[PDB]
Amino acid sequence: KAPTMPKPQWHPPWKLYRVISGHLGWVRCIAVEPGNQWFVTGSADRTIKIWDLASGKLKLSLTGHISTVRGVIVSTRSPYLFSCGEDKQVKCWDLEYNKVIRHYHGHLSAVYGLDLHPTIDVLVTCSRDSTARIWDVRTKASVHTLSGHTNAVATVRCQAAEPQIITGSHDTTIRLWDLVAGKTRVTLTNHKKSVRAVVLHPRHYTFASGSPDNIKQWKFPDGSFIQNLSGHNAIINTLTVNSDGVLVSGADNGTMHLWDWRTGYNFQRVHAAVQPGSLDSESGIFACAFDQSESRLLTAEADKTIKVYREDDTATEETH
């Protein structure tokens, strides 16, 4: 009887099937290969380490960060991963030798997020000072400094179609940038509390942003308020979206809410436990990433643990 009550599509629920307990420090950002074989994480243990995605073992732990690792991503086009952390350092870990080769420099404060342009070989990084930078890979030269925010810039994603770069910041605003001229195209003032996660879809348009008030959802040319989503009212950290429309929002108090893209229907509302040492008030999700298969949803949490989830093969958890 509600507007769009009958038409969400039924997605199956997710369940844990392993946790991975390796770090000594908050596991903080997860990426996963383009070729599905293994995944990778940073920490506040100052150690990146990669893990077999099938059996969960530890392939190797490679280190070199002076302080914590806030972001790690692995390139598709090139055989090397990139890392960034609060030691002001952004590094190009070559994977054929397991060693740093580029070691980008120029951020005046800590470094929060990084992302790769999926078609051309640049790299967009976001900091604490106020700025985001377009590093040119192969030249390690700042093409642009995207100076338009007034506080910390918590996350950044970028794509191939216009608009190119989306920076969600800690001054409660999103803004959408021109990669060529450097000037901002359109800023998006909503979100009484700060935006900390944006994600894009990747079939059709329509990205979505994350904040303690009212996770919203937008539409790429000009920016257009499509919809806001329901009351997941913690200070949320991550957004991830699967190619069949399920969407996970991970938050700082441990609660992670499954959704759907289509309606906005809060689906599962799963809240996990801590592993024995941690106190009760230390559950919180800092990263979540689906597999390339998108059968596995695996989250890096404040309990120094990667939790790996999968589907459930039933039918009778039906939509209300």
């Binding site: 599905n36 054929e96 070989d121 592993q275 106190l279």
Partner: protein, 102 residues
């Protein structure tokens, strides 16, 4: 039109900004180059990979002494590999703080 100091306004040719690694390795064909990603299944392949990796792990001498038997070693056995992360109670810190201080 008059950029910052890196562009034209400075002759400070600092080291660490010297043309190192000036060509990019592209991921060639035997690895997971994106042409070999545009069609691959990723789901049945992961499933058979974990279905393969899951099955990998398959008297008259001392009768005057007082304590004639403690009868147990650890009282069951000693194999834990457990992980407390409260770092003062972790077994790594226990062995550290019994090896070095005495």
């Amino acid at each position: 039109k008059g950029e910052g100091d890196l562009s034209q306004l400075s002759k400070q040719y600092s080291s660490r900004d010297l043309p190192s690694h000036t060509k990019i390795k592209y991921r060639q064909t035997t690895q997971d180059a994106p042409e070999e990603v545009r069609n691959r299944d990723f789901r049945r392949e992961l499933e058979e990979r974990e279905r393969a990796a899951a099955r990998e792990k398959n008297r008259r001498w001392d009768d005057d002494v007082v304590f004639k038997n403690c009868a147990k070693g650890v009282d069951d056995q000693k194999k834990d590999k457990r992980f407390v992360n409260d770092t003062l109670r972790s077994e790594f810190h226990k062995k550290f703080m019994e090896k070095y201080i005495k």
